[PDB]
Design a protein around this ligand. Structure first.
Ligand SMILES: O=P(O)(O)OC[C@H]1O[C@@H](O)[C@H](O)[C@@H](O)[C@@H]1O
Length: 288
């Protein structure tokens, strides 16, 4: 079933109503995904769900710029990670009962007014969210609705996976890939056979295809699998102690121990869309 309220849309799977996903209209932000009652995503207990600022947790949507830009006249005006996660999207309706599937839309006319004035480019976004019995698929389509101007953008899903304990966690299938380390400010190949975590981590992997599933492992158990289409980059991030402490909307302060962000995106360069052209991609979360 699919239920709409003033602030959100909630999907429950017909075969098992304890499998569910909650999507805030603000940012079209998935903030909970339960699989047979078990929460899959990390959400700060102090996250704002009231539209006052981006949600600290779940799956914030990053568009049209990942990070902070300092090279483009207009993109450099936007705050870190763009304006999609700061704007209230329109609920376009349900498209299927089983698996429950819904769509959300964004265009400048309904987006964050302040930020739209800073980056007055035309676009149409449609997010499709499909709740399977054992997966969550979040798909995006971007259309350049301008008749004359090229549309230049990044897209990323800022996925906060819930885990039991970060220091026991490893991430597989990234061995041998090139990354840019945003902390050390250098690029290098990951020569570790798995990724482990004992400090702040903020890295951007390049060249991951639809064929490479990334797995999150704890106690020899594969607790999450991330698949994607058309998102060649993967950001891996954990704020660790100090940064967690400095984020007012991040609670509990030990909460970095129960999350890892593994964020599929197109962020290494900008996508350029000619007038009337479209681009699409998705992230697919599951368990193998
Ligand atoms: O705090 P935000 O804007 O949600 O971004 C989360 C993190 O995003 C990363 O891309 C940045 O490198 C970090 O510095 C930042 O803390």
């Amino acid at each position: 079933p699919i239920k709409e309220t003033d602030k959100e849309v909630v999907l429950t799977h017909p075969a098992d109503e304890t499998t569910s996903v909650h999507i805030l209209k603000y940012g079209a932000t998935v903030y909970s995904w339960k699989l047979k009652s078990e929460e899959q995503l990390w959400l700060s207990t102090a996250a704002k769900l009231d539209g006052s600022k981006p949600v600290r947790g779940g799956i914030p949507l990053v568009f049209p710029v990942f990070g902070k830009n300092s090279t483009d006249e207009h993109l450099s005006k936007l705050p870190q990670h763009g304006l999609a996660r700061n704007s209230t999207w329109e609920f376009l309706g349900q498209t299927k009962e089983n698996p429950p599937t819904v769509q959300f839309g964004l265009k400048p006319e309904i987006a964050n007014p302040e930020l739209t004035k800073l980056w007055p480019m035309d676009y149409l976004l449609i997010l499709t969210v499909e709740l399977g019995s054992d997966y969550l698929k979040t798909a995006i389509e971007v259309e350049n609705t301008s008749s004359s101007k090229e549309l230049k953008f990044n897209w990323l899903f800022h996925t906060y996976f819930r885990i039991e304990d970060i220091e026991g966690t490893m991430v597989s299938n990234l061995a041998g890939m090139k990354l840019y380390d945003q902390l050390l400010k250098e690029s290098y190949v990951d020569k570790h056979p798995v990724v482990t975590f004992n400090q702040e981590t903020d890295v951007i992997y390049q060249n991951v295809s639809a064929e490479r599933a990334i797995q999150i492992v704890d106690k020899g158990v594969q607790i999450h699998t991330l698949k994607r289409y058309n998102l060649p980059d993967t950001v891996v991030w954990n704020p660790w102690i100090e940064k967690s402490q400095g984020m007012a909307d991040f609670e509990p302060k030990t909460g970095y121990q129960q999350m890892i962000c593994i964020e599929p995106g197109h962020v290494h360069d900008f996508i350029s869309l000619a007038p009337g052209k479209k681009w699409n991609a998705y992230q697919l979360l599951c368990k193998e």
